Amino acid sequence: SKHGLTKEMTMKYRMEGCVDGHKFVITGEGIGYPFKGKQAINLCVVEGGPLPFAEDILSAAFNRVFTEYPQDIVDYFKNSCPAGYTWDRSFLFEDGAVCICNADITVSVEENCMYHESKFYGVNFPADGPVMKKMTDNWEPSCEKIIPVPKQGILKGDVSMYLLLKDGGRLRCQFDTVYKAKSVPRKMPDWHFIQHKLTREDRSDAKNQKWHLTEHAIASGSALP
Amino acid sequence: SKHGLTKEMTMKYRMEGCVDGHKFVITGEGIGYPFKGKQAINLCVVEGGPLPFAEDILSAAFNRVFTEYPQDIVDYFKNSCPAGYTWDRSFLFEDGAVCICNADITVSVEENCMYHESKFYGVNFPADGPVMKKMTDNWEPSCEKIIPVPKQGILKGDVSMYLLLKDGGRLRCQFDTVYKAKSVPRKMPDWHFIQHKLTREDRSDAKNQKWHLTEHAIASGSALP
Amino acid sequence: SKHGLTKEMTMKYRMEGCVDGHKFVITGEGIGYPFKGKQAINLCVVEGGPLPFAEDILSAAFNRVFTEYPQDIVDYFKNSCPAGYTWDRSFLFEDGAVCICNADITVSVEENCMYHESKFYGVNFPADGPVMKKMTDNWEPSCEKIIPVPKQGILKGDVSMYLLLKDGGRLRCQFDTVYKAKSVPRKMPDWHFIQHKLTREDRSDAKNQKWHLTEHAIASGSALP
Amino acid sequence: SKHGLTKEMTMKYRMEGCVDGHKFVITGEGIGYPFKGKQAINLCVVEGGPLPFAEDILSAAFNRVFTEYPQDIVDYFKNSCPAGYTWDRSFLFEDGAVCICNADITVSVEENCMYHESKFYGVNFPADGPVMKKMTDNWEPSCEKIIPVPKQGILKGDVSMYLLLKDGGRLRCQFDTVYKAKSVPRKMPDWHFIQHKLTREDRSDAKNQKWHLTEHAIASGSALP
C-alpha cells in the first residue's frame, strides 16, 4: 500500500454518455498492474445497447495510474492516490466529429480496488463515416507528451491519435487532456512521454453488448542526451 | 397555431452542465416572437452558483424557431413544430477550450409554450484566460451558413464566432451544429444564411446568479444575383 | 480618377506558384467595374501547364478594389489606390492540404489599369482527393467577415469556404486573410461583411490551358438593428 | 559511399523565403554525421537581413538523412541517396500563423557534400506575438510519427511542436510533412518514431545576421511489445 496501491489490483467502472442523441450506460470490471502499466477490462452495455457507434471511440476514456514510471520521473498519478485524480479530454476527429470525456479515479484501499466514473459526449459523427458504420479496427500505438503546468500543479497531455480502419485506412483524432490530482502536489514531474498500446475484442452475445479492452503504457524522457 | 405556434409565446428552460469539473443547473423563463425572430429570457442558476466561468459561453446554447424566415425559404424549424427538433453543437475556442452542447426543443400548444432542455459540457478553459476570469463582453453579431444534408433530412450550421473582451480584445470560437427535426421532412431548404445578434445583462443579486439574454435572428439567401 | 479609379478598368495578372513540387506561371487579363464590384478575367498557363490540380483552388487568389461599398462604410481598398494594397492568406482544407497566397495590387492611372502580382504555394493535397483528380465544381457563394485591427491600420478577413464537388459533395476550406494598404490610413472601417459569388469556365485548347473567371462582391453591415 | 554517403560529410544551403511581405535569402554551410543523426550548421542572412522574425521559425526547415536508424527499420532517406528526396511541410501555429516550407536534398558524391535548397513562406504572425517580437527561446525536444503511404511510396510526418518562450511560455505549432524520394522505392518502412533535439545560437555581428544550429535525431519503433 505504497499510496494505497498494490502490485495487482481490481477495477470497477461506470460510464454514462450521449453520442449524437443516443444515451448509454456502460459498466465494467478488470484487473490491473499499476507498476507494470498494464490493465485488462471487460465492459458491458447496460442501457442503450447495442451502441450505434464503434466501441473503439470509448477506448481511451476507459487511468494513468497504470503507467510504468522509471524511478527518476515523478509519478503524478500514483502520487495522487488513494484519493486519486480527475481528467478532462477533448477528441477532435479529422472529419469534424468532436468528443469530450471526463473521469474521476479513486482507490478503495480496503477492497484493493480502483473506482472509475466517467462521462462521454460526442457530436457530429458523419452518418456514413467508419465510426457510425462500425468499420474501425483499433487505435495505432502512440506517444503522448505530458507537460507540467507548474503554477497550477496540473498536467496536460497532447497526443495525435490514429484510429485504424477495417478497409486499411486511418482516421486521425487529436487528444488534448488536462490531468488534475485532487490535491495539487508540491512535487511535479518534468515534461515526459507516455507510450500507449491498446487492444480491443468484441465479446458480444445475444443478451449483452460486451467487449474486452487492454492497455500497456510506459513513461520515458527524451531519447536525446 | 400555424405548427402550434403563435405570434407571441412564452418559454421555459432547464440546462444541466459541467465545465472543467464544475457542475451546474440553470433554469429560465422568457417571451419570444417566432415570426420576428426575437426572444428575451431570464436565467437563474439553481445549483452550482456562482458559476466560475463567463455567462457568455452559454448564450448560444440558450432555438431556431426564433428566426425570421422570408416566405421563399423553407422554414425547417417552424415546420418541425410542435413536436420540435434537437441540435448538437461543438464550440472550438482559439485557446484550446472545447465545448459540446445538445438541446431538445418542444411545443406545448395548450400552454402556448416552448420547452427547452439542454446539456452543456466544456473542457480546458485556461485558468488565466478571459472566460475563467470573467472578462468577456458579449458575442459580436454574426452570419451563420445553414447547409442542407438532403439524403438525411438534417441541416448543418457553420459560424465563426467572436467573443468580445472587456479589454478591447476578441476571442474566436468556431461553432459547428447539426440540426435534426424529430421527423425528417420531405420539404427541405436550400443553403441560406442566418444572421444573429445577442445581448446579455447580468442581474445577479445576493440570493441568486441571474441574467437576461436577448436574440434577434433573420434568415436570408445570398446577396448576389 | 476618384483614387485613380474609373467606372470601367482593365486588369493584368502575373502569378508564380508551386503546389506539391509542381511549379507554374499564369498570366491573365480582364475587365472590371470597381464601383459595382464586378470583374471578369481570362487566365493562361504560361509555364508548367497543364496544371495537375483543379483550377478552382486558384480562384480567390486571382482584389478587393472590386467590391461594392455603400457610402456609409469606409472603403479601405479603393482608399488605398492608386498605390494600392497587399494581402496574405492561408487556405486550410478539411483534408489536411494547406495553401498560402500573397498578392500586390497597384493602379496605373495613365493606362487606367490594375496590376496584380501574386504567389501561390500549396502542400499536402491527397493524391486521390478531388483537387488532384480535378473533380471540383466551383466555390459556393460566401459571406466574409472583415475586421479592423485599429492599432495597426490593417484588416483581417475570415471566411469558411466550400468547394463544390462534381459528385455532389462539398470540400471545406478555411480562409484567413490579412489586408494591408501600402500607407496605413487614418480612416478605418468598422467590421463588416463582404459577400462573394464566383464563376469559372475552362476554355482550354491544344496550345494552352486557359480559363475564364468572374467575381461579384458586395459589402454590407449586420442585418440586425 | 554506402548510397554516396560517408560517416562525416559537409553541407551547403540556400533558402529563399517571404514571411508577411518580407523577402529574404539565407545561405549556410555545415558538418554532419548521417549514421549518428547529427548535424551542426551556420547560417548567414544574405538578403533581407536583419530578419523581422525569430530565427527559430526556420530551424526545422534547415534533412532526414541525418537520423540514426537501427538496422531493423528501413531507412527511406539514406536509401534515396545520392539523388535524394524532397519534402513539403505545413506549420500551423496556435495563434493563427501559417507557414509552408519545401526542400530539395541532393548528394554530390565527388565533393562528399549534401546540397539543400529550400523555400519558406509564412503568413499572419501577430505583430505583437513572440515571433515578431523575437521573444522565443528554441523548440522543445519532440517525437515525430512517420507513416508510410504504401500505394504511393511516400511518407508522412506528424509532430506537435512547442516553441519555448523567453518569458517561460510555450507556443504550439502543428507540423504535417510529406516526404518523397525522387524514385519511389520498392522497399518501405513501417510506421516509426523519430525523436529530435535542436539547439540554436545567434552569432550575429555588425556586418551579418548569423547563427548556429544543431540537430540530433534518432528513429525507433514503439516501446510496447
Short mmCIF file of C-alpha atoms in Angstrom, two decimals, chain C:
data_model
loop_
_atom_site.label_atom_id
_atom_site.label_comp_id
_atom_site.label_asym_id
_atom_site.label_seq_id
_atom_site.Cartn_x
_atom_site.Cartn_y
_atom_site.Cartn_z
CA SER C 1 -9.98 59.23 -61.22
CA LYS C 2 -11.52 59.04 -57.78
CA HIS C 3 -8.28 57.39 -56.24
CA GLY C 4 -7.05 56.82 -59.81
CA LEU C 5 -10.06 54.62 -60.46
CA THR C 6 -12.67 54.76 -63.23
CA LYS C 7 -16.06 53.06 -63.61
CA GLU C 8 -14.63 50.51 -66.08
CA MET C 9 -10.97 49.38 -65.93
CA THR C 10 -8.71 46.77 -67.44
CA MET C 11 -6.52 44.38 -65.40
CA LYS C 12 -3.29 42.45 -65.93
CA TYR C 13 -2.06 39.47 -63.87
CA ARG C 14 1.06 37.52 -63.29
CA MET C 15 1.06 34.58 -60.82
CA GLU C 16 4.02 32.32 -59.90
CA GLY C 17 3.49 29.30 -57.72
CA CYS C 18 4.29 25.80 -56.62
CA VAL C 19 1.82 23.16 -55.42
CA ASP C 20 3.39 19.91 -54.04
CA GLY C 21 6.57 20.36 -56.10
CA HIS C 22 4.87 21.41 -59.34
CA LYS C 23 5.92 24.93 -60.41
CA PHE C 24 3.83 27.18 -62.65
CA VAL C 25 3.42 30.70 -64.03
CA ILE C 26 -0.01 32.04 -65.08
CA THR C 27 -0.75 35.33 -66.81
CA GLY C 28 -4.16 36.93 -67.25
CA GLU C 29 -6.02 39.99 -68.50
CA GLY C 30 -9.54 41.19 -67.61
CA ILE C 31 -12.19 43.95 -67.38
CA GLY C 32 -13.65 45.17 -64.08
CA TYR C 33 -16.13 47.61 -62.61
CA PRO C 34 -14.76 48.77 -59.22
CA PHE C 35 -17.95 50.54 -58.11
CA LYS C 36 -20.22 47.59 -58.94
CA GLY C 37 -17.76 45.01 -57.54
CA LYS C 38 -17.57 43.03 -60.77
CA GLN C 39 -14.65 41.63 -62.65
CA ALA C 40 -14.22 39.09 -65.48
CA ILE C 41 -10.82 37.71 -66.37
CA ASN C 42 -9.05 35.22 -68.58
CA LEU C 43 -6.08 33.21 -67.40
CA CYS C 44 -3.48 31.47 -69.43
CA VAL C 45 -0.95 28.95 -68.11
CA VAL C 46 2.36 30.03 -69.46
CA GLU C 47 4.80 27.64 -67.71
CA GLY C 48 4.05 24.29 -66.06
CA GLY C 49 0.79 23.62 -67.95
CA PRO C 50 -1.30 21.53 -67.94
CA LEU C 51 -1.73 22.03 -64.15
CA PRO C 52 -2.01 18.82 -62.13
CA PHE C 53 -4.56 20.37 -59.76
CA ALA C 54 -8.09 21.88 -60.05
CA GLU C 55 -8.09 25.50 -61.48
CA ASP C 56 -10.64 26.26 -58.74
CA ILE C 57 -8.02 26.37 -55.96
CA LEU C 58 -6.53 29.49 -57.52
CA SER C 59 -9.87 31.41 -57.89
CA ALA C 60 -9.72 33.59 -54.70
CA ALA C 61 -6.06 34.23 -55.31
CA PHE C 62 -6.93 35.97 -58.64
CA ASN C 63 -8.66 42.27 -55.49
CA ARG C 64 -10.99 43.85 -53.01
CA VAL C 65 -11.00 47.08 -55.05
CA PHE C 66 -13.80 45.16 -56.86
CA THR C 67 -16.34 45.26 -54.11
CA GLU C 68 -19.47 47.38 -53.96
CA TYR C 69 -19.26 49.54 -50.89
CA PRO C 70 -22.25 51.58 -49.60
CA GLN C 71 -21.43 55.35 -48.96
CA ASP C 72 -21.62 54.62 -45.24
CA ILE C 73 -18.83 52.05 -44.87
CA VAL C 74 -15.24 53.17 -45.26
CA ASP C 75 -13.77 51.60 -48.43
CA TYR C 76 -10.24 50.65 -47.23
CA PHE C 77 -9.39 49.18 -50.61
CA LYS C 78 -10.34 51.99 -53.02
CA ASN C 79 -8.94 54.45 -50.40
CA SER C 80 -5.53 52.76 -50.81
CA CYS C 81 -5.48 53.46 -54.53
CA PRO C 82 -3.61 54.20 -56.71
CA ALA C 83 -0.52 52.90 -54.87
CA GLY C 84 -2.76 50.07 -53.71
CA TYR C 85 -2.55 47.31 -51.05
CA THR C 86 -1.13 43.80 -50.43
CA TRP C 87 -2.73 40.73 -48.81
CA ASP C 88 -1.55 37.38 -47.37
CA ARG C 89 -3.93 34.46 -46.97
CA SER C 90 -3.87 30.93 -45.58
CA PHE C 91 -6.15 28.19 -47.02
CA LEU C 92 -6.80 25.31 -44.59
CA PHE C 93 -8.65 22.48 -46.44
CA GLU C 94 -10.54 19.92 -44.35
CA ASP C 95 -8.36 17.01 -45.70
CA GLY C 96 -5.02 18.48 -44.49
CA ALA C 97 -3.99 20.44 -47.55
CA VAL C 98 -2.63 23.93 -46.79
CA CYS C 99 -2.07 26.87 -49.10
CA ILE C 100 -0.57 30.31 -48.79
CA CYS C 101 -1.15 33.15 -51.23
CA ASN C 102 0.21 36.74 -51.39
CA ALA C 103 -0.75 39.47 -53.82
CA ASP C 104 0.30 43.03 -54.60
CA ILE C 105 -2.40 45.32 -56.15
CA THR C 106 -1.34 48.55 -57.89
CA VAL C 107 -3.01 51.09 -60.25
CA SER C 108 -1.54 52.64 -63.40
CA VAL C 109 -3.68 55.80 -63.71
CA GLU C 110 -2.32 56.64 -67.16
CA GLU C 111 -3.25 53.19 -68.53
CA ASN C 112 -6.49 53.00 -66.47
CA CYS C 113 -5.20 49.53 -65.48
CA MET C 114 -4.95 47.48 -62.25
CA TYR C 115 -1.79 45.38 -61.88
CA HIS C 116 -1.88 42.12 -59.90
CA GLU C 117 1.26 40.17 -58.92
CA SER C 118 0.70 37.01 -56.80
CA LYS C 119 2.46 33.91 -55.38
CA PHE C 120 0.56 30.69 -54.67
CA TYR C 121 2.03 27.76 -52.62
CA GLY C 122 0.16 24.60 -51.62
CA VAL C 123 1.18 21.44 -49.84
CA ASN C 124 -0.26 18.08 -48.98
CA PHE C 125 -3.20 17.72 -51.42
CA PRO C 126 -4.19 13.96 -51.22
CA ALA C 127 -3.19 12.27 -54.50
CA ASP C 128 -6.67 10.75 -54.61
CA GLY C 129 -8.75 13.74 -53.41
CA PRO C 130 -10.97 15.87 -55.73
CA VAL C 131 -8.37 18.66 -56.19
CA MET C 132 -5.68 16.41 -57.72
CA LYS C 133 -8.34 14.38 -59.57
CA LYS C 134 -9.83 17.63 -60.89
CA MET C 135 -13.28 16.72 -59.68
CA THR C 136 -14.29 20.10 -58.23
CA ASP C 137 -17.08 22.26 -59.48
CA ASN C 138 -16.66 25.85 -58.25
CA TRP C 139 -16.90 27.59 -54.85
CA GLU C 140 -20.28 28.16 -53.17
CA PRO C 141 -21.26 31.88 -52.65
CA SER C 142 -20.00 33.06 -49.26
CA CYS C 143 -20.06 35.71 -46.59
CA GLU C 144 -16.71 37.01 -45.41
CA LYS C 145 -16.30 38.93 -42.14
CA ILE C 146 -13.87 41.90 -42.38
CA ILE C 147 -12.39 43.02 -39.07
CA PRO C 148 -10.34 46.12 -38.42
CA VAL C 149 -7.13 45.98 -36.42
CA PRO C 150 -7.12 49.61 -35.31
CA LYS C 151 -3.68 49.88 -33.67
CA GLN C 152 -2.21 48.65 -36.96
CA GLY C 153 -4.35 50.15 -39.66
CA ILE C 154 -4.86 46.71 -41.29
CA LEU C 155 -7.90 44.44 -41.84
CA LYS C 156 -8.46 40.71 -41.32
CA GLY C 157 -10.82 38.53 -43.26
CA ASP C 158 -12.41 35.35 -42.02
CA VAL C 159 -14.43 33.16 -44.44
CA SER C 160 -15.39 29.43 -44.19
CA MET C 161 -15.41 28.41 -47.89
CA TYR C 162 -16.97 25.38 -49.59
CA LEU C 163 -15.55 24.00 -52.78
CA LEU C 164 -18.37 22.14 -54.56
CA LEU C 165 -17.59 18.71 -55.97
CA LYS C 166 -18.68 17.18 -59.32
CA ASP C 167 -20.15 14.12 -57.43
CA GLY C 168 -22.47 16.39 -55.35
CA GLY C 169 -20.02 16.67 -52.43
CA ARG C 170 -18.53 19.72 -50.73
CA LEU C 171 -14.98 20.24 -49.51
CA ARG C 172 -14.49 22.81 -46.71
CA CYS C 173 -11.69 25.29 -46.74
CA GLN C 174 -10.92 27.91 -44.04
CA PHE C 175 -9.58 31.30 -45.43
CA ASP C 176 -7.78 33.70 -43.05
CA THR C 177 -6.53 36.94 -44.68
CA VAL C 178 -4.51 40.00 -43.73
CA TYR C 179 -5.17 43.09 -45.87
CA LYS C 180 -2.57 45.89 -45.76
CA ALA C 181 -2.79 49.29 -47.54
CA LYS C 182 0.69 50.46 -48.57
CA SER C 183 0.02 53.56 -46.35
CA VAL C 184 -1.75 52.79 -43.16
CA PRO C 185 -4.85 55.09 -43.28
CA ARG C 186 -6.19 57.30 -40.52
CA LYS C 187 -9.62 56.41 -41.83
CA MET C 188 -10.68 52.83 -41.00
CA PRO C 189 -13.92 50.90 -41.45
CA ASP C 190 -15.87 49.17 -38.74
CA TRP C 191 -16.21 45.40 -39.06
CA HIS C 192 -18.50 44.49 -41.93
CA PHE C 193 -19.36 41.63 -44.29
CA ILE C 194 -18.33 41.06 -47.88
CA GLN C 195 -20.44 38.58 -49.87
CA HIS C 196 -18.89 36.91 -52.84
CA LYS C 197 -20.01 34.94 -55.85
CA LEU C 198 -17.60 33.39 -58.34
CA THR C 199 -17.93 31.63 -61.68
CA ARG C 200 -15.29 29.69 -63.54
CA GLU C 201 -15.22 28.17 -67.04
CA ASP C 202 -12.37 26.18 -68.60
CA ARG C 203 -11.57 27.39 -72.11
CA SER C 204 -8.54 25.20 -72.64
CA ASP C 205 -7.41 24.23 -76.14
CA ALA C 206 -4.49 22.29 -77.60
CA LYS C 207 -1.85 25.06 -77.23
CA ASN C 208 -2.80 26.43 -73.82
CA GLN C 209 -4.60 25.74 -70.56
CA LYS C 210 -6.93 28.74 -70.30
CA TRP C 211 -9.99 29.62 -68.29
CA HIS C 212 -12.42 32.40 -67.51
CA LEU C 213 -13.17 33.67 -64.02
CA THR C 214 -15.80 36.10 -62.71
CA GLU C 215 -16.44 37.67 -59.25
CA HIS C 216 -19.36 39.72 -57.95
CA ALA C 217 -18.83 41.08 -54.40
CA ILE C 218 -20.88 43.44 -52.18
CA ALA C 219 -20.08 44.87 -48.72
CA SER C 220 -22.70 45.34 -46.01
CA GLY C 221 -23.19 45.68 -42.24
CA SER C 222 -25.20 43.44 -39.98
CA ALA C 223 -28.85 42.86 -40.87
CA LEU C 224 -29.87 43.34 -37.23
CA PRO C 225 -30.75 46.88 -35.95
#
